[PDB]
Amino acid sequence: TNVYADSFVIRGNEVSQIAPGQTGNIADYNYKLPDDFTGCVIAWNSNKLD
Amino acid sequence: TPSALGKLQDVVNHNAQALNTLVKQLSSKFGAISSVLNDILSRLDPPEAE
């Protein structure tokens, strides 16, 4: 029905914080996911670009 | 002879025993890591705690 794409770059090791029920600097202050999240998470290395 | 009313005594004994064995079931670990819900929520993440 409604699909939205979010884009952001983290320091790499914080990918575990982008998940429902997680805590941390990114999860609690920048980007929080709800416990009822229904979607997909896509993350890849960008050391050559950013 | 105090054993004359054993029929009526077994009625209140079976009900008391059924309630006592029901409380002890709360201490059981039905395949979980603990029998306390507060401990599971504090130790594991919401994705795994479910």
Resolution attained, angstroms: 3.0
**Residue of chain A minimizing CA distance to B46:** A21
- Which chain B residues have a beta carbon less than 8 Å from that of A22? 45
**In this structure, what is the dihedral angle of CA atoms B36, A34, B45, B42, given to the nearest 10 degrees?**
-50
How far is Cα B17 from Cα B19, in angstroms, rounded to an integer? 5
Q: Could you tell me if A20 and A32 are in contact, meaning their C-beta atoms sit under 8 angstroms apart?
A: no
- Determine the Cα–Cα distance for residues A49 and B34; give it in Å rounded to an integer: 47
Structure tokens at A48: 């050559």
Q: Do A35 and B46 touch (CB under 8 A)?
A: yes
Instruction: Assess contact for B22 and B29: CB atoms under 8 A.
Output: no
Determine the distance in angstroms separating the CA of B41 from the nearest CA of chain A, rounded to an integer. Answer: 11
